[PDB]
Structure 1
Amino acid sequence: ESKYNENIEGLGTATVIETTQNKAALTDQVALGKEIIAALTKARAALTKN
């Protein structure tokens, strides 16, 4: 849902976009895991910051 966030907390919710691009371009079945690890770090950070 667009343009809205509950209250004006400085809250973000936020969704982390994947490093590089194209699922089908990744399909190594390895490094995809590296992307998920990286993403888990970053999501841990985003979630922590709020």
Structure 2
Amino acid sequence: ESKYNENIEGLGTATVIETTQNKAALTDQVALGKEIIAALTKARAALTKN
């Protein structure tokens, strides 16, 4: 959506992008999993803060 969340500024969501890494050079089946792991930690934390 654009500019529209629910209950004033009371809450809000986000979608965590991969941090400083590219999808192209990936599909090496190893670095992928690690990246997804750390990024998912960031996602979990981002949820907790909410």
TM over 0.5: yes
Q: Post-superposition shift, 1:19?
A: 2.3
TM-score, structure 1 length as denominator? 0.79
Q: Which has the higher helix share?
A: 1
- Structure 2 stretches lacking a partner, 5+ long: none
Q: Within 2, Cα distance between the matches of 1:19 and 1:49?
A: 19
Q: Give the total of aligned pairs.
A: 50
TM-score, structure 2 length as denominator? 0.79
| Dislocated runs of 4+, deviation >6 Å | none
**RMSD (Å), alpha carbons:** 1.4
